[PDB]
Amino acid sequence: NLICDFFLNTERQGPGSPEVTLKALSFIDNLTNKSLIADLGCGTGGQTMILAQHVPGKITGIDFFPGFIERFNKNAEKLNLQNRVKGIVGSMDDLSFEKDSLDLIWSEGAIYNIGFERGLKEWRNYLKPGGYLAVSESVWFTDQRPAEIHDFWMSAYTEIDTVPNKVAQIQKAGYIPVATFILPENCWIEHYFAPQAKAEEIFRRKHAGSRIVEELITSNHHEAELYSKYKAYYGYAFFICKKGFS
Ligand SMILES: C[S@@+](CC[C@H](N)C(=O)[O-])C[C@H]1O[C@@H](n2cnc3c(N)ncnc32)[C@H](O)[C@@H]1O
């Protein structure tokens, strides 16, 4: 409801950065102006527009919040990409894409809404054999971690896991684990948490007295506080996978 509004004030609603999106793209080599691309849980489309400026083909951005899709389509226009890039309000667990029709499925910081292993399994049916799946997901950097952070994550995303386990689940799902890399901390600080600050000031005064808004801000500071304290134990990792049977 009012949450979309808060996030409309940021270039991105999750950890990431232009360099990271392009570094992930650097592992995808099957695209042409005939390629069909989908970006699941695209948010306002920050990473989608970056992607669109470097790869040919049509891109469909899909997101649950109508507020984000409107922003996605308006930005697309200011950029003159509305012919090959269009936002659609929908859900990643209820897609209507033709089967085995996509060359690439993109999803940054959004697969947790449906679960990693579930996403791998379900989205595979919408990809052409030899197509690509590129997703950024939360991961543990080690096998042991302090309780404070571990518990926080069980209450947010129970499916967070180490890089090795994620990689084995990818192969198990019937994909070739093409490329896997950990995101730099600036994807969390410089590009995620820092920008949320400017937004809070302005947002909080505008919605003064709103219990929802106040708790959102508390939730942000807590998450940020936890990261700068346990950043050495977790983060995001990008996973590029090619659907088997080439
Ligand atoms: C962490 S944000 C990332 C947004 C954008 N991908 C980015 O990296 O800036 C998660 C996104 O998933 C979207 N989302 C949540 N549930 C969804 C669902 N069931 N189907 C599609 N999108 C969903 C949320 O609205 C939000 O835009």
Short mmCIF file of C-alpha atoms and ligand atoms in Angstrom, two decimals:
data_model
loop_
_atom_site.label_atom_id
_atom_site.label_comp_id
_atom_site.label_asym_id
_atom_site.label_seq_id
_atom_site.Cartn_x
_atom_site.Cartn_y
_atom_site.Cartn_z
CA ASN A 1 0.00 0.00 0.00
CA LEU A 2 2.09 2.93 1.31
CA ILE A 3 5.19 0.75 1.03
CA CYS A 4 5.29 0.96 -2.77
CA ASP A 5 5.31 4.73 -2.32
CA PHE A 6 8.40 4.60 -0.18
CA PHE A 7 10.26 2.49 -2.74
CA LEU A 8 9.16 4.64 -5.66
CA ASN A 9 11.67 7.14 -4.27
CA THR A 10 14.65 4.86 -5.02
CA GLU A 11 16.34 3.73 -8.22
CA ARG A 12 16.24 0.15 -6.88
CA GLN A 13 14.29 -1.85 -4.28
CA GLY A 14 17.03 -4.38 -3.51
CA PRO A 15 20.84 -4.88 -3.39
CA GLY A 16 22.55 -4.41 -6.75
CA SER A 17 24.33 -2.01 -9.07
CA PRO A 18 24.78 -1.25 -12.80
CA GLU A 19 28.15 -3.04 -12.88
CA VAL A 20 26.72 -6.17 -11.28
CA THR A 21 23.81 -6.37 -13.71
CA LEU A 22 26.20 -6.04 -16.69
CA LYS A 23 28.75 -8.47 -15.17
CA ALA A 24 25.95 -11.06 -14.97
CA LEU A 25 24.92 -10.21 -18.54
CA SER A 26 28.51 -10.80 -19.68
CA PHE A 27 27.87 -14.52 -19.18
CA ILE A 28 24.83 -14.59 -21.53
CA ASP A 29 25.64 -15.09 -25.25
CA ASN A 30 22.49 -16.26 -27.09
CA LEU A 31 20.63 -12.96 -27.48
CA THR A 32 19.55 -11.30 -30.74
CA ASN A 33 16.82 -8.80 -31.66
CA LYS A 34 14.53 -11.84 -31.83
CA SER A 35 15.16 -12.88 -28.23
CA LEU A 36 12.33 -12.95 -25.70
CA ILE A 37 13.31 -11.77 -22.21
CA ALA A 38 11.40 -11.66 -18.94
CA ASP A 39 12.39 -9.89 -15.74
CA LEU A 40 10.55 -11.40 -12.77
CA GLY A 41 9.96 -9.12 -9.80
CA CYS A 42 11.37 -6.15 -11.69
CA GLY A 43 10.31 -3.41 -9.28
CA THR A 44 10.57 0.06 -10.84
CA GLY A 45 12.76 -1.51 -13.51
CA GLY A 46 16.12 0.02 -12.65
CA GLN A 47 18.07 -3.08 -13.64
CA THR A 48 15.67 -3.79 -16.52
CA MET A 49 16.40 -0.50 -18.30
CA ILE A 50 20.14 -1.05 -17.76
CA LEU A 51 19.70 -4.48 -19.28
CA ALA A 52 17.61 -3.13 -22.19
CA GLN A 53 20.32 -0.66 -23.20
CA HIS A 54 22.85 -3.45 -23.72
CA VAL A 55 20.93 -6.35 -25.19
CA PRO A 56 18.65 -6.63 -28.25
CA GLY A 57 15.29 -8.36 -27.99
CA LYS A 58 11.99 -7.75 -26.25
CA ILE A 59 11.71 -7.63 -22.49
CA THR A 60 8.65 -8.19 -20.37
CA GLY A 61 8.96 -6.94 -16.81
CA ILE A 62 6.60 -8.60 -14.35
CA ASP A 63 5.80 -7.29 -10.89
CA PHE A 64 3.12 -7.69 -8.19
CA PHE A 65 2.82 -4.00 -7.28
CA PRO A 66 0.90 -1.89 -9.86
CA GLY A 67 2.69 1.14 -8.46
CA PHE A 68 6.04 -0.18 -9.65
CA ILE A 69 4.79 -1.20 -13.09
CA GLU A 70 3.45 2.29 -13.76
CA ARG A 71 6.83 3.72 -12.86
CA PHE A 72 8.45 1.08 -15.09
CA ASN A 73 6.34 2.05 -18.09
CA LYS A 74 6.80 5.79 -17.62
CA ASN A 75 10.58 5.41 -17.37
CA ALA A 76 10.52 3.18 -20.42
CA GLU A 77 8.87 6.01 -22.35
CA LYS A 78 11.24 8.77 -21.29
CA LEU A 79 13.84 6.39 -22.72
CA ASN A 80 11.92 5.48 -25.88
CA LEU A 81 11.89 1.74 -25.11
CA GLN A 82 8.14 1.24 -24.82
CA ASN A 83 8.22 -0.67 -28.13
CA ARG A 84 10.53 -3.42 -26.80
CA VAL A 85 10.26 -3.01 -23.02
CA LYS A 86 6.94 -3.14 -21.21
CA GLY A 87 5.92 -3.63 -17.59
CA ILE A 88 3.10 -5.99 -16.57
CA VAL A 89 1.45 -6.48 -13.17
CA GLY A 90 1.51 -10.20 -12.37
CA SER A 91 3.01 -12.88 -10.14
CA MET A 92 6.04 -15.09 -10.73
CA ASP A 93 4.13 -18.09 -9.36
CA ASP A 94 1.32 -17.61 -11.86
CA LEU A 95 2.82 -16.82 -15.28
CA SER A 96 1.06 -17.05 -18.63
CA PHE A 97 4.19 -17.20 -20.81
CA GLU A 98 4.16 -19.68 -23.69
CA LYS A 99 6.07 -22.81 -22.69
CA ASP A 100 9.75 -23.08 -23.68
CA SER A 101 9.55 -19.64 -25.26
CA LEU A 102 11.99 -17.43 -23.42
CA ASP A 103 15.71 -17.11 -24.12
CA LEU A 104 16.41 -15.43 -20.78
CA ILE A 105 14.67 -15.04 -17.40
CA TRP A 106 16.11 -12.28 -15.23
CA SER A 107 15.39 -11.76 -11.55
CA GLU A 108 17.33 -9.69 -9.10
CA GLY A 109 16.49 -9.90 -5.43
CA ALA A 110 13.02 -11.26 -6.14
CA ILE A 111 13.20 -15.06 -6.31
CA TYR A 112 12.83 -15.41 -2.54
CA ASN A 113 9.14 -14.50 -2.94
CA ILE A 114 8.63 -17.92 -4.54
CA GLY A 115 11.63 -19.81 -3.17
CA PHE A 116 14.89 -20.59 -4.95
CA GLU A 117 14.39 -24.30 -5.69
CA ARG A 118 10.74 -23.63 -6.57
CA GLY A 119 11.74 -20.83 -8.93
CA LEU A 120 14.34 -23.02 -10.59
CA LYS A 121 11.79 -25.78 -11.15
CA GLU A 122 8.88 -23.67 -12.31
CA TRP A 123 10.60 -21.09 -14.50
CA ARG A 124 12.44 -23.86 -16.31
CA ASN A 125 9.19 -24.69 -18.12
CA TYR A 126 9.08 -21.20 -19.68
CA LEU A 127 12.63 -21.33 -21.06
CA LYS A 128 13.72 -22.54 -24.47
CA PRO A 129 16.20 -25.41 -24.09
CA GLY A 130 19.61 -23.75 -23.83
CA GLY A 131 17.94 -20.60 -22.54
CA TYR A 132 19.36 -18.68 -19.56
CA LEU A 133 18.28 -18.03 -15.98
CA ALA A 134 20.05 -15.21 -14.12
CA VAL A 135 19.06 -14.50 -10.54
CA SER A 136 20.58 -12.75 -7.57
CA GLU A 137 19.83 -14.46 -4.25
CA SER A 138 20.74 -14.15 -0.56
CA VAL A 139 23.44 -16.60 0.51
CA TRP A 140 25.62 -17.60 3.47
CA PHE A 141 29.32 -17.01 2.83
CA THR A 142 30.27 -19.76 5.32
CA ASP A 143 29.07 -22.91 7.12
CA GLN A 144 28.86 -21.31 10.55
CA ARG A 145 27.23 -18.03 11.57
CA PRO A 146 26.28 -16.09 14.73
CA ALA A 147 22.73 -16.63 16.06
CA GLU A 148 21.54 -13.03 15.83
CA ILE A 149 21.95 -13.02 12.05
CA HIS A 150 20.91 -16.62 11.51
CA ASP A 151 17.61 -16.12 13.35
CA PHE A 152 16.89 -12.85 11.56
CA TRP A 153 17.04 -14.75 8.28
CA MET A 154 14.82 -17.63 9.35
CA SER A 155 12.11 -15.06 10.04
CA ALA A 156 12.60 -13.31 6.71
CA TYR A 157 13.75 -15.93 4.19
CA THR A 158 14.06 -19.53 5.43
CA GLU A 159 15.61 -20.62 2.13
CA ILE A 160 18.84 -18.64 2.34
CA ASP A 161 21.72 -21.09 1.92
CA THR A 162 25.44 -21.35 1.13
CA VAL A 163 26.77 -20.92 -2.42
CA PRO A 164 27.65 -24.65 -2.75
CA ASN A 165 24.11 -25.78 -1.88
CA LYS A 166 22.55 -23.25 -4.26
CA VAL A 167 24.85 -24.48 -7.01
CA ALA A 168 23.98 -28.13 -6.40
CA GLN A 169 20.26 -27.27 -6.46
CA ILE A 170 20.78 -25.57 -9.82
CA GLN A 171 22.37 -28.62 -11.41
CA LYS A 172 19.74 -30.80 -9.73
CA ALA A 173 16.99 -28.68 -11.30
CA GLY A 174 18.35 -29.58 -14.72
CA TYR A 175 20.57 -26.57 -15.52
CA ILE A 176 24.25 -26.08 -16.19
CA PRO A 177 25.73 -23.72 -13.54
CA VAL A 178 27.42 -21.35 -16.00
CA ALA A 179 28.56 -18.50 -13.72
CA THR A 180 28.26 -17.66 -10.03
CA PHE A 181 29.56 -14.57 -8.25
CA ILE A 182 29.14 -12.72 -4.95
CA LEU A 183 27.99 -9.11 -5.06
CA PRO A 184 30.36 -6.36 -3.72
CA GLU A 185 29.35 -4.65 -0.47
CA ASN A 186 28.75 -1.39 -2.30
CA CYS A 187 25.67 -3.13 -3.76
CA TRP A 188 24.22 -3.04 -0.24
CA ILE A 189 25.69 0.19 1.11
CA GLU A 190 26.26 2.70 -1.70
CA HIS A 191 23.41 1.42 -3.92
CA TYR A 192 20.85 0.16 -1.43
CA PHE A 193 20.96 1.33 2.19
CA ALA A 194 22.48 4.76 1.58
CA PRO A 195 19.77 5.85 -0.93
CA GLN A 196 17.07 4.72 1.55
CA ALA A 197 18.24 7.43 3.94
CA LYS A 198 17.36 10.45 1.79
CA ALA A 199 14.01 8.81 1.14
CA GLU A 200 13.10 8.34 4.84
CA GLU A 201 13.37 12.01 5.79
CA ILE A 202 11.05 13.15 3.00
CA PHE A 203 8.76 10.13 3.25
CA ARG A 204 8.24 10.30 7.02
CA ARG A 205 7.23 13.96 7.04
CA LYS A 206 4.83 13.51 4.16
CA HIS A 207 3.08 10.61 5.90
CA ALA A 208 3.42 11.99 9.43
CA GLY A 209 1.58 9.95 12.00
CA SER A 210 1.39 6.85 9.82
CA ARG A 211 2.11 3.76 11.95
CA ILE A 212 2.95 1.76 8.80
CA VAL A 213 5.55 4.25 7.59
CA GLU A 214 7.19 4.50 11.01
CA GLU A 215 7.66 0.73 11.30
CA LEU A 216 8.98 0.50 7.75
CA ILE A 217 11.74 2.95 8.69
CA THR A 218 12.51 0.99 11.85
CA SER A 219 12.68 -2.19 9.77
CA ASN A 220 15.12 -0.56 7.31
CA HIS A 221 17.54 0.65 10.00
CA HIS A 222 17.46 -2.77 11.65
CA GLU A 223 18.29 -4.56 8.41
CA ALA A 224 21.01 -2.04 7.64
CA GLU A 225 22.38 -2.33 11.17
CA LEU A 226 22.49 -6.13 10.94
CA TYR A 227 24.34 -6.05 7.61
CA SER A 228 27.13 -3.71 8.65
CA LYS A 229 27.61 -6.11 11.57
CA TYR A 230 27.33 -9.50 9.86
CA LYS A 231 28.26 -8.62 6.25
CA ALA A 232 31.18 -11.04 6.46
CA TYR A 233 28.73 -13.92 6.89
CA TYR A 234 26.19 -13.27 4.16
CA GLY A 235 25.21 -11.29 1.10
CA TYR A 236 23.81 -11.81 -2.39
CA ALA A 237 25.20 -13.97 -5.15
CA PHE A 238 24.29 -13.89 -8.82
CA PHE A 239 23.59 -17.24 -10.45
CA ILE A 240 23.57 -17.69 -14.23
CA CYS A 241 22.20 -21.05 -15.35
CA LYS A 242 21.59 -22.61 -18.75
CA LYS A 243 18.58 -24.93 -19.19
CA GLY A 244 19.82 -28.45 -19.96
CA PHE A 245 19.48 -30.50 -23.13
CA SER A 246 20.99 -27.39 -24.74
C1 LIG B 1 13.73 -6.93 -3.45
S1 LIG B 1 12.57 -6.29 -4.64
C2 LIG B 1 13.66 -6.14 -6.11
C3 LIG B 1 13.09 -5.23 -7.19
C4 LIG B 1 14.03 -5.14 -8.40
N1 LIG B 1 14.18 -6.47 -9.00
C5 LIG B 1 15.39 -4.62 -7.93
O1 LIG B 1 16.32 -5.46 -7.84
O2 LIG B 1 15.49 -3.40 -7.68
C6 LIG B 1 11.42 -7.70 -4.83
C7 LIG B 1 10.38 -7.47 -5.93
O3 LIG B 1 9.58 -8.66 -6.04
C8 LIG B 1 8.24 -8.20 -6.28
N2 LIG B 1 7.29 -9.31 -5.99
C9 LIG B 1 6.95 -9.74 -4.78
N3 LIG B 1 6.14 -10.79 -4.90
C10 LIG B 1 5.97 -11.03 -6.19
C11 LIG B 1 5.27 -11.99 -6.92
N4 LIG B 1 4.56 -12.93 -6.29
N5 LIG B 1 5.33 -11.96 -8.25
C12 LIG B 1 6.03 -11.04 -8.89
N6 LIG B 1 6.70 -10.11 -8.23
C13 LIG B 1 6.70 -10.08 -6.89
C14 LIG B 1 8.12 -7.08 -5.25
O4 LIG B 1 7.01 -6.24 -5.59
C15 LIG B 1 9.42 -6.33 -5.54
O5 LIG B 1 9.25 -5.44 -6.64
#
